[PDB]
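Objective 1.3, modelling of assemblies. Example input:
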Amino acid sequence: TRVFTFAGGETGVWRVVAMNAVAGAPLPGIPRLNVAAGSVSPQPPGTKWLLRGITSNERYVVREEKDRLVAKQPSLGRAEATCAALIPIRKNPSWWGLSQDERRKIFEEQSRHIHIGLQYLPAVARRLHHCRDLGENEPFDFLTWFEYSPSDETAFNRLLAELRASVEWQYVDREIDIRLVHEP
Amino acid sequence: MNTRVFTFAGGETGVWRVVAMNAVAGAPLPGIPRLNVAAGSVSPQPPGTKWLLRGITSNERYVVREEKDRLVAKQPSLGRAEATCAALIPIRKNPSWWGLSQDERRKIFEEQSRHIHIGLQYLPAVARRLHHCRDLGENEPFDFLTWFEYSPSDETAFNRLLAELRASVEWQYVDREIDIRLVHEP
Ligand code: HEM
Ligand code: HEM
Ligand SMILES: [Cl-]
Ligand code: NA
Ligand code: NA
Ligand code: NA
Ligand code: NA
Ligand code: NA
Ligand code: NA
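Predicted structure (tokens):
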């Protein structure tokens, strides 16, 4: 399955414990989050908002980087990773008009995104969802999903601080940081 | 509406008359007499439609600044009055392609296949638009909808371009290709 839909509302297995608009306009506060797989999923009862994205092919990663990620990255769904974060991100529109080399330079050569992220594995599990090429309008360009143990929360926060200080983050115009704890 | 999404509606309606449907690789689409290029998503299917193909224009995945600047200078506008021929060429690439890393695909696409280098040789004759399908969902029949416009005097040239690209390393990964030729109504 490539398509995932994140429903914020009154029902779901993830309890929302924090929501902050890091950049741009806030999203409505909600108590629970549900994640559904596939292209024809139902809207859960009591849904306030729905965000959809699709996993996709690599846009920047080179083979040598891929091999490092494969060696180090954890799986989604670990028993002990009871904390999660959903971080919807929208880029500045100018980003999308840049050429491929220009974006790769900002992303990795300047911002060191992968290099930094690698330093937080195996603590942090991740999944990247793309929104901008779906058939239907989405308010964000990416839905980023993370999972980690409670004891790794401060490491996750440090990762975010490092990325938010990067050149790449100058191009982030909306970013919502939603923190979750899995239901018992 | 989003200015990036288009639906190609094969059927009994539209400004484009279908003159040929070439089954280049893999199974063809049902024969159609006309083509409509609609903004956005189409539902329900208009009377007379046999099929709908949707795609979205998107950001560059491979081109570098030096290439882009060449393209911007040389490429013609879409919608030129004299460019009464068009081609709609749906393309699918195989699963192996999509699992390759970015450097591997860029190497195939340009360093080996010379896609852009070749295509530049056919500007300003040929106007083009690339539409992406694979991030609409897992169940689109093609990965790309490619659209071209040219004058009838440039049709032989366009055919030469196609033969060059179809001989390239990149095309080793193409597992479906249909080539539909159109002429604009008067
Ligand atoms: C946990 C460690 C992390 C690692 C190893 C990592 C790795 C990566 C990799 C490999 C890509 C490129 C994918 C491609 O080639 O298409 C990527 C893209 C991306 N990542 Fe991360 N990442 C991490 C954390 C984060 C965090 C915490 C955020 C959000 C706050 C984030 C936001 C993004 C975005 C928005 C993209 C899309 C490309 C772009 O930057 O324009 N990543 N990441
Ligand atoms: C007329 C001259 C042509 C030029 C200048 C040209 C140029 C380009 C450029 C710059 C890209 C890369 C876009 C990016 O960075 O995302 C591209 C992609 C593509 N072109 Fe062409 N092209 C031409 C003709 C054709 C023809 C005739 C076909 C089909 C038979 C074709 C099929 C494609 C496909 C399928 C892609 C997507 C590649 C992928 O993302 O894997 N092109 N072209
Ligand atoms: Cl991207
Ligand atoms: Na994207
Ligand atoms: Na997308
Ligand atoms: Na495009
Ligand atoms: Na593109
Ligand atoms: Na692509
Ligand atoms: Na590609």
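Chain A is about 25% helix and 35% strand.
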